[PDB]
Design a protein around this ligand. Structure first.
Ligand SMILES: O=C(c1cccn2cncc12)N1CCN(c2ccccc2-c2cccc([N+](=O)[O-])c2)CC1
Ligand SMILES: O=C(c1cccn2cncc12)N1CCN(c2ccccc2-c2cccc([N+](=O)[O-])c2)CC1
Lengths: 302, 302
């Protein structure tokens, strides 16, 4: 028992992290097979950063302008190309620690683990969700660009996120590993703002099931709601609408606990209208929305 | 910016995890050099578990009764011994992935990362604190015994925790890596209960400094308190007393923010007496006590 914010073990990704330097600019890269992937903004300086023309910037580089270090070993760059907002540096040596991998783009509402790195060296691991507005509420400092986000299934690492920047509100923005931004963001230092966010309703319900599995029952009640009457209240409180597909996804947890999804929705309705009255659920005094149904099943059965 | 529950990268510990089986009983072990460390309760069955005499149980075992698997490789056991509540199995092969390591016992109030494992295979990583009452609020299922807790400094893994059991309240109990329990607990399936816990005051103050560093200022006020008048309120709310040593430890954060420790204590006094009024700090609607001053400095400067 117990329920924690839990990340995937990071070892397979640690063996892929390298440092990439172009000039005075250093960040992290991901070394898979004989390619290193990194944010293309490594080719900017503070002079360019405001509105770079990346095509011109890259034409003016050569292979020898890129210094890649894997530990103390320098890897020689033998080719370079741009892939949307990612740079691909071909190196003369394939990474012997390359895991089985794929590049997957995730949806808003889904979670992943982040390995935060500085200077090519892994510093910490945490879990987060892709928000409805395509930002992440991460923890990243200067130097952390090129840190990646991932999930692991069996032996295979599905990379989903590469870190590019911090927005003025302190949340984070980045790309998939094909270099395409999540959200309406661009890789320049400008006036960008995260749009309005919403709470991920299916994940709040999943976490209420986790709470019941762990013995927190106080918010349960004898009522039920329709899906439509629930979604009416959802809209008022800035929650995403709950679909029948979401109801279906919560099936396993509803069966484990014996509490119908629309019965749990009546609890959530009550919590939104009334608050918690000073009580807690799974150690929290607010409704948590960054655990998916899959995340809950992972900790609350195995 | 941003502040997350962050664990250490787990790779160095992943390369040490093995499966240990004695009979029908399987759990995890830690393979360092030519020794595997695991909970001695691997030598029990459900028949013994209520009140085992471990000395008699171990005398009746031979090397061949222990099956150790490192992936698909079976490691041959060539010796066995008991070390308090840990079993040490000498194997014929030294682990080539052994990191630099030490075995350290931690204090209540300190944090560490847990690599939760099942069948010798790493499943997830999370961060937690040693509570004042010597339990941990972990996330562990059947099969997770022998999972370890650790911190990393530079290249060196300091192992501090091996998991042994779950108490009736759903919190967790275990040993240091010399086999000595944290807390007044024993490795038998009996009527054990966690004692009364307290909130770790120095860590709450550290997290309030983290909040200020990240732009949450609403709880700040123009007041100050004495240490003695603060500790008076601390006692009422079940918080540990704040020492001058704690004040000294918070020095760096107080200097970074410009807010004296006893000025921050007046904020904490106000939050304890009044609540948050519906507001949040770092994404939480309660006061968080599982980040140390060191943890805060790590994310809020590097
Ligand atoms: O690493 C951080 C960073 C700072 C603070 C908090 N963070 C949390 N996650 C990451 C950070 N950068 C460096 C890169 N930046 C850029 C973003 C878009 C386009 C170009 C650049 C750029 C390129 C060359 C030099 C410079 N430059 O000199 O500023 C900036 C963003 C800020
Ligand atoms: O793995 C879990 C576990 C279950 C549920 C939640 N958990 C969260 N962390 C770990 C768990 N065990 C197995 C070991 N147990 C024991 C604890 C003390 C002394 C002996 C035994 C013992 C030994 C041989 C067989 C059996 N047996 O058959 O029960 C039990 C505790 C329960």
């Amino acid at each position: 028992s117990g329920f924690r914010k839990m990340a995937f073990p990071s070892g397979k990704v640690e063996g892929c992290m390298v440092q990439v330097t172009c000039g005075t600019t250093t960040l992290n890269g991901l070394w898979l097979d004989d390619v290193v992937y990194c944010p293309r903004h490594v080719i900017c300086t503070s002079e360019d950063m405001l509105n770079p023309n990346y095509e011109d910037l890259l034409i003016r580089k050569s292979n020898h302008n890129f210094l890649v270090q894997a530990g103390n070993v320098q890897l020689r760059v033998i080719g370079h190309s741009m892939q949307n907002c990612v740079l691909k540096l071909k190196v003369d040596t394939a990474n012997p620690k390359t895991p089985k991998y794929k590049f997957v783009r995730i949806q808003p509402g889904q979670t992943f683990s982040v390995l935060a790195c500085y200077n090519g060296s892994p510093s910490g691991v945490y879990q987060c969700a892709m928000r409805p507005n395509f930002t992440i509420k991460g923890s990243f400092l200067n130097g952390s660009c090129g840190s990646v986000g991932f999930n692991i299934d069996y032996d295979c690492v599905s990379f989903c996120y590469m870190h590019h920047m911090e927005l003025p509100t302190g949340v984070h923005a980045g790309t998939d590993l094909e270099g395409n931004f999540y959200g309406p963001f661009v890789d320049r230092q400008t006036a960008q703002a995260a749009g309005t966010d919403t709470t991920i309703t299916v994940n709040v319900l999943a976490w209420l099931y986790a709470a019941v599995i762990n013995g927190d029952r106080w918010f349960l009640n004898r009522f039920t709601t329709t899906l439509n009457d629930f979604n009416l209240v959802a809209m008022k409180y800035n929650y995403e609408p709950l679909t029948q597909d979401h109801v279906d996804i919560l099936g396993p947890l509803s069966a484990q606990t014996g509490i119908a999804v629309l019965d749990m929705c009546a609890s959530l309705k009550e919590l939104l209208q009334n608050g918690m009255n000073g009580r807690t659920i799974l150690g929290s005094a607010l409704l948590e929305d960054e655990f998916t149904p899959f995340d809950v099943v992972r900790q609350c059965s195995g």
